[model samples]
Target chain A: IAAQHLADGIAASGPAPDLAAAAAFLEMGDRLGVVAHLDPDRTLETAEVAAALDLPEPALVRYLDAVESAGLVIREGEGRYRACPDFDTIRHQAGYISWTMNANRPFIENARDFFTDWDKAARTHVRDYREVAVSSQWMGSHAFYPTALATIIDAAPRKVVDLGAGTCRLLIEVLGAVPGSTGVGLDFAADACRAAEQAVAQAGMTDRLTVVERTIQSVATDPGVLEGADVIHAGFVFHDMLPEEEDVCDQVLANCRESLAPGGFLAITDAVPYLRNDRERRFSAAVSYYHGEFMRRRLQSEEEWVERLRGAGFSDVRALTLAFPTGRLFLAHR
Target chain B: IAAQHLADGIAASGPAPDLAAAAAFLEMGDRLGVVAHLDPDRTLETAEVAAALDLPEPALVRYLDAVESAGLVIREGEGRYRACPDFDTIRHQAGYISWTMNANRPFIENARDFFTDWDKAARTHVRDYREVAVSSQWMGSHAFYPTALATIIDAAPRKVVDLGAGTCRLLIEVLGAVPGSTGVGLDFAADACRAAEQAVAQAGMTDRLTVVERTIQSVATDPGVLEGADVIHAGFVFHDMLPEEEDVCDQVLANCRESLAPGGFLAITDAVPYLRNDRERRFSAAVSYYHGEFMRRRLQSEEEWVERLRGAGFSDVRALTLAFPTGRLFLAHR
Candidate 1:
């Protein structure tokens, strides 16, 4: 029933909005428009197109087939094609284009051996993470963000602290939801803190939000940044903290509990593996490959989250499984 | 008039399809589809989508706006959205997805500094060129490939040789066009030679095609590879030969003159700065940046080609400027 609910919920969510595609299309639009001459109404055969564009017919035909596959063009008749008429698709595609193109252009254009380059990978990840964060903000479907915000609004928490609050988008929103609430945004990347500070100021909540450039793991031993919070929430962050170690996950939970005030709550949200159906299972499987290969992190199952939350001496622990891009949310009383 | 012709030609040439967008979209489909649940028929408001997809309302709004812009969704009312209804669009988007994703994932996930690494760039260029070649073939408007091919066919030479013949696509076409003709393909890159060999075998013209893993410049003195050729063709390959040195370009041309049989022709088709209008000039300028930065080569003007050809003691030199992607083709008898 749980699996079915997850699958059903996923089914009702509508079509997935692709960020990478949006980004690629956005960047390539100008070049593509230059090639297509920005005329959606125009249609031409491969031979004529080859003659006009000065490309070889064989190659242009293949390229046209690929373009058609990309939804940018359509085959009208026998060996004839036209551009897509929808303007909205082009705009949305453009949104992600700059980020995706800039993030990956050099990487694709350079770098012979990738995995062996630790410094390169680490540095690139910094920029890539920023893009991901911004893109997540655009999509608004990041794991547990809306739920956590809803929970915060429902609880009407007086004070809040967000661990791994890169750019403070969540904290700013939380403050906005609860007008009188004060919050602390903690992140390790200095650039992130700067951006968070800027975001807070832009949101006109600088007086209500404190942006700290500190790693959340320090909360385990020091708890300085996490201290005095009515609610402590971390979203899509815990898995990447110390992925190779289960001890760190447990320690962090315990520390979050300790850092909270009386009647305070601890909210943890991150990517979780949920295989409710064949399609969902395959999607999750692919995500796991990316997590292992590109992200180099281990995601927990719901049972694992439950065990860890309970083991951390938390009571009234509730674990919620999210549908569509599966994530787990755990809320526990301190 | 020329500018209008160029624009018309570009339009007739089909759209400039982007692989990156396709790649990004393709990989993201399962993830995004999981978000959207692959329900092409479904529709929802931004707020509802935020709740369903677990995204914050503000971000979801932005994402939806972008999606609408990309023509993946439509806004029927103030906050409503639905997935695109076109099946061809989705498939085409998926086609380039894998290539775009794989090509950049490693680099984006790994490399820190680009351009500083020459070895990495050189190695990456080989694969990049393959993609370019394949893409060019699909578009078929690679400067003057068609015109050059037409000329070659019109000449109907008994023997042919292509210098800088990466992948042997052009050479194979030439051999196929002339039933009794045989050709030798010369290239420096071993990987390119391997690909050319494969391409020839796949086309079932291996008997007529001989791919030599050697640099064209080496033929200047040796002439062994060029000895029996009735037509010496170099397509989009010479500018990169010795970009900063005119002496080297002249020597190569002179060598071809000496190597050709009686009444044999030297055919050259390459990216030249043939600015008949503002658009063409801008296109040339843009390509110049790519040449200087990415390609690390210099592009010459039409007058330069004429001067160089005459300087090399070639007679009856004729150069033609092409529309669309803007290239110049030159032919001379030796």
Candidate 2:
């Protein structure tokens, strides 16, 4: 039923809307195009379609099976394939949408082994709680962040969202430093948020620190989750992934603006790509590769990061060295 | 004049092709079928197009830009991009193709970063040379491929094509490898292919590797190039990309087969999902990101590869590891 709904929606779309009935519709398109090109008189064959689409003959057969079932196209003669003239418009639309994204909901169902392994291997303190349970309010010290953070809180704004807030260390720090300021932690994996909730309670800031479970992409989907904020901080997480996932990036900035009481700030801390980086060095290379690999095979330079923030309506985008030991910080305010 | 030609092409294609166009036009057919599912009525925004294609907006824009620049499509008001309706029915053809073996030639400009990084960073080849260069030896490797070369030589295959044949390495290799396999090493990077020819001579494979600087998608336009290819070997290519691009894949494969003797072979080689024992340790994770951010991105497993091969019409198929040292090899005699 959903597939049919999808098919119907596609059919009703305007001239170039993207739609896929099955592999068959696509196959017929290729086959027909090839035939039309070769003969110019409009003759097609499964062989021709297969040839045009570079689809294996077997896959072409599967395509024919689907297209035949859909009744939008047909195969004729011994090796020929054809589409009804009416379907030409539809096939043209399909051609325009020659792309698709990674399936989000089923999560890892169709992912290759490589993809699955990297996802599992690229772990963080937020995703691993039981391991960090015995820690003394520490999951690797905050480097020099605490001191600088302490300095910032003197003029701390209305609210803060610790994006990927693992263990809520920054949340607690912000709460203590800025009296009356509320903090929220949003994470894709819920476990860390829950941990943050507990830590908030332990610190008696339970009422102030509101931790939520949701990805930055899904965050804007809910109107309320984005309400109330003066600052958004994605420590370590920003530097770890691709900056091009501007969907999530835009959502974070959008929410920051919406929740932010005018003049709100956005601070990000991540493993910055440093100068004199080594490609062959195992640890550094692994970090670099893992970073590039995890965020969807795209890398962003410091200039790129600055442009992203500025484009998202931030004023004066710049990175600064934080007291935290290894990574750098980016700050932008609107 | 070129822009005008493209605009004329788009105008000729119309509001959209009917079913007849869907069955007849190559690019049109693909656009009609897929876009219908997501943006029926064709009123989709850039972000929506990006969402449907499973790519970032910037990337999708670039993808569309290629075909659009050919005068095949026009972006409508309010971010709604539309394809020429008659694209399905128009004469199929290609205009510009980059056939460079240089890793920098935006050959698959659609997946720009994928090819560049794979060769330079991940593969650690230092040199940008890749399967395109190796396969440019299509003429050279003809001697190696017992099935099609014999037929092409016996019957005197008039025209031949080498796709994504970077630097026409195979052409150079074929200079000594094949007797009279005069063929064009077609690609999106023209200058790169010119450079590849020098190396082909250096490698002593020049007599066979004819350079045809064109794109795989614009096959019909390069009828001169596609006229004959008694044989085609994808050669360690064909995997590392998305399935939507499969239409292009199918067309090229079919075209190669169609351009072959009744018993022509389509030999392909790449690292299949489970083909290697140390996939996870050595290649899996990096390879996945080498393709996309979603780690689950698998090109083709041995099973799927075989199925696709058989589907493409090679009654005979075998996985052959070419002691070439880098990838899992497979050959299919059609």
Candidate 3:
């Protein structure tokens, strides 16, 4: 419910300003010594907090309201507040807020320059633009990662190959799902590989993860690289790649089928296209406006994905709806 | 004379395409095995070299003409081409042509979007855009770095401070010019700081050079940061900074006056404004059309700079004209 509320709020109002708002609130907290006064383990009244922090009661009320908006604190009653108990959820949401705002600023701001003078734009993107994009996606994945990880843990695959693994976050999730499960994460962007390397090292799963800096399209030529994979996980990558080359997508799926061990599965999670109606577009504002308006491409419908999985020489295809920006996961077997 | 010719050529044809031209010529050289077949130590006619490279005589003629235009090989006699004897000079010239071309492409291409949607343009610039800019400045500095470095060496400052030191290339040059001299290089951009760190490390002056991640405006509050400095250096940063805040510039220079050791000097090098004459504008086309049209600011004239320096409590100010895009260096003692 908290995730759903965040997603809806982001759609209603963009996430760009929220990060700066959060930062300013934190600065205010520091200045007022609100952090030192409040304990995560205890509930406190505004007057008590004001007294402890040596600040005026009215100022303390305003500061608490700001922190409430940041989801770090919640109003329990009149002038009473409690520090958020679920630290993990608040942390993920906050991380997403900061990372998305920082990362998408470039793409959103330079949309005209990026499209009009792409060659020169390529030079700009080469420096740090690509890294921001990957890092943004990395943070976004964390918000919905557990839900996907649950499905993987149930399937219990021992070896995995993650295609289009932007930051290796999903691969790390899969590796965490099964203790002995090893993973090979593939992405084309060099900066993405660099970010993923740092992330994998941070996760302390270095021994279990192999991040290969290569395009997913390479799978068609060298399926042997994924020899022992019992599961192949792709998250949020198919939508971007599908528009670029449908044939390559088919080839990639076919390669996954060949690479997987017998009785193994392929898991894909990406945004499904909304219906071609005004209300659908209005309801999916985050998808329609934020990405669809600029990207201007069609995404596969649920039925179309099911049909495509069947067409790609797969059987026992199934789909499950996921939350936040409305993605779906498809599981299939060779 | 060669530098002047190169500068004139750049102004005539904006430097953007020259790098691609150089690359194409290199590709042609590879396809024809020009390096393996020909010797820089010897001169050869088109026919003999063409025979050796196994390329058609007419094609070889065209390729040689292009390389000559790139200033790598030269026409020594009737149908005779020889590799330029002064390798370093030719290499620097060719590299500048390429770097300048790549750097200015974004500004030239995104001229309208820059003015129309500057907030978004700022986002685009935050990632790779500024890096390209700093890198471009880094390469451009090399062309006339020796000229600026010579002025500092003559003054023989034991300690130096460089404001808005983009990549620390110019600062490193100052450190190299005077052994036992410790230097401070200040920049606001994190990427610039990262780049300067690598550069300072590569130059083996990490011990002698201190790169501070603070803006030039910080001087107003923390003039002591640059204290004990005999010479302060700024390269091509004044023009961009002056437009943002003339008051800040005044404050900065005033602070520099206080920070400097007695009898210490302030060294400034940047593109001075061309005279409002047809020939001057034509000769400074790279400055007027490339940066002027988009950036839409007036560069200070030589006299204006002298007056500004004197106004900031300096005396005995002098200016030197440097080559390759025609920058001027101003020196004054506090």
Q: Candidate 2: where is the Cα deviation over 4 Å? A: A1-144, A226-228, A239-245, A277-284, A293-299, A322-326, B1-334
Scanning candidate 2 chain A in windows of ten residues, the lowest lDDT window is A99-108
The alpha-carbon root-mean-square deviation between model 3 and the true structure, to one decimal in Å, is 22.5
Which candidate number has the best TM-score?
1
Q: Kindly report the docking quality category of candidate 3.
A: incorrect
Q: Candidate 3 at residue A162, lDDT?
A: 83
Give per-residue CA lDDT, model 2, range B138-193, as digits (tens): 21221123322333344334344556676664444343455655766766776787
1 versus 3: better DockQ goes to? 1
Residue B198 in candidate 1, Cα distance off native in Å: 10
Best by lDDT: 3
- Compute DockQ for each candidate against the true complex: 0.03, 0.03, 0.01
Which scores greater on lDDT, model 1 or model 3? 3
2 versus 3: better lDDT goes to: 3
The CA root-mean-square deviation of candidate 2, after full C-alpha superposition on the true structure, stands at 24.2
Error of 2 at A245 (Å): 4.1
